[PDB]
Symmetry: D2
Subunit: 116 residues, 4 copies
C-alpha cells in the first residue's frame, strides 16, 4: 500500500471508523480526477486504496469526510471536510502515510514518507 | 473583522510572517469565488480581511500558501498548501479566528468562534 | 508579561475559560518551586502571570489542569493534566506565549517566542 | 503490548528514530517509580515496553526525551521533554497507544485506547 490513510478521533480516543476517504489526482487539464476512495475500518484505515503501478508521480488530493463522521455521532462540526494536497513520488516511488487527528473544531494532518 | 486568520511556525517558534492567505466563498454554481486575501503581518495575521456586512452566512474556504512559506525558509514541505473549508452560521457567535500551526510535514487548524 | 499562556478548546471551538494554570521554576535542588498561577479568563489567558524582573533565565514548568476542565464539561478525559517544560534563555526574544489546544484525548502545545 | 508509544518527526516527515522513552508509575508514597524504558526503532516505536501482567491500574507518566532527539539533529528545541500523564486500566485492562508528533517548538500527543 503506497498510500495509507489513518484517521483518529481525539474526543473518543479511538480510530475514527466508517469515515469516507476520497482521493483525486490533478489531471492534464487542471481539474481533479477521481483516483481512489474507501471507508476506514476498525483500525481507522481504509484498506487497499491504490497500487504501486497506479500511484504514479502527480499532485494528489486526499479528502476526508469529517463532517459526515461528526454528524453521525450527533456533533455539528466546524469543518466541511479535511483535505490534504501534496506532490507525490516526484523523486521516485515512496510510501506515504497520511494521519488525520479529528476534533469538532480542529484537525491536524501529518505525513510520514518512507522509502519503499 | 468577523474573520481573522492567525498563522504560527512550529519550527521557529514565531508567527509565520509574509504568508499569503486567500479566502473564497461558495457560489450557487458550486464554484469558489474570490472573497478576500492578504499577507500575514509580523503578528502572523493578515490585517483586515473582511467586514461584517460582506461576511454573510455561507460556505467559505481559507487557503494558506504554506509551500511558498517553507520555500522561503529553505525547508522542503509536504503540502501544496493548507485549506480550511467551513460553514459560517449567524446562529453561531459573531467572530471567527482560524488558527493554523505549521510544520514542513504537518499542520493543524483550529476555529475559535467567540461572541 | 514576558510569559503568557493561551488555552483553546478544540471540542467547542472557544477559548478554554476558567482553567487553572500553575507555573514552577527549577531550583538548585532539582525540585520545582511555585512561581506563578492563575485561571484563564474569557480570552483563554490567565492575565498577568509574571513580570520581566522575576522572569530570569532558567527551567520552567507550566501545568494546565485539563482534567478539571473536561470534568466541568461532563466529558471524560485521558490526561491527568498537560505540562510544558522549557528553558528560558535571554539570548532568545523577550516574550513567551505558550499556546495549548485541548481535546479530551489529545493536546498540542506550541511556544511563540517574539521580540 | 498493552502500552505502545509512536513518535513522529513533523520536520522530516518520518518516524522519530532512536528517541528514549521512559515510563514511571505513581507509587504509594506519591513519588514516581521507574516502570519501563526503551528507544524508538525505525518504526518510531520502542518494542516491548511492558506486559499485561505488569501493567496494572495506576497513574503512569510517559516521558519522551525530545530534547536529545532535536539536539542530535542540530536543532535547539524549546521543550526539555514531552510528558504524558494518565490513569490506566481503572475500568479494566485496555491497550493504549500514545502518539507524539514532534516539532522544535511544538508537540502534540494523542491517545488511542482499545479494548484488549
Amino acid at each position: 500500500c503506497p498510500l495509507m490513510v489513518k484517521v483518529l478521533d481525539a474526543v473518543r480516543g479511538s480510530p475514527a471508523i466508517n469515515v469516507a476517504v476520497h482521493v483525486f489526482r490533478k489531471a492534464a487539464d487542471d481539474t481533479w480526477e477521481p483516483f481512489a476512495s474507501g471507508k476506514t475500518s476498525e483500525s481507522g484505515e481504509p484498506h487497499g486504496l491504490t497500487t504501486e503501478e497506479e500511484f504514479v508521480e502527480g499532485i494528489y488530493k486526499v479528502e476526508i469526510d469529517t463532517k459526515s463522521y461528526w454528524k453521525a455521532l450527533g456533533i455539528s462540526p466546524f469543518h466541511e471536510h479535511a483535505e490534504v494536497v501534496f506532490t507525490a513520488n516526484d523523486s521516485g516511488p515512496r510510501r506515504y502515510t497520511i494521519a488525520a487527528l479529528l476534533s469538532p473544531y480542529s484537525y491536524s494532518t501529518t505525513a510520514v514518507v518512507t522509502n519503499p
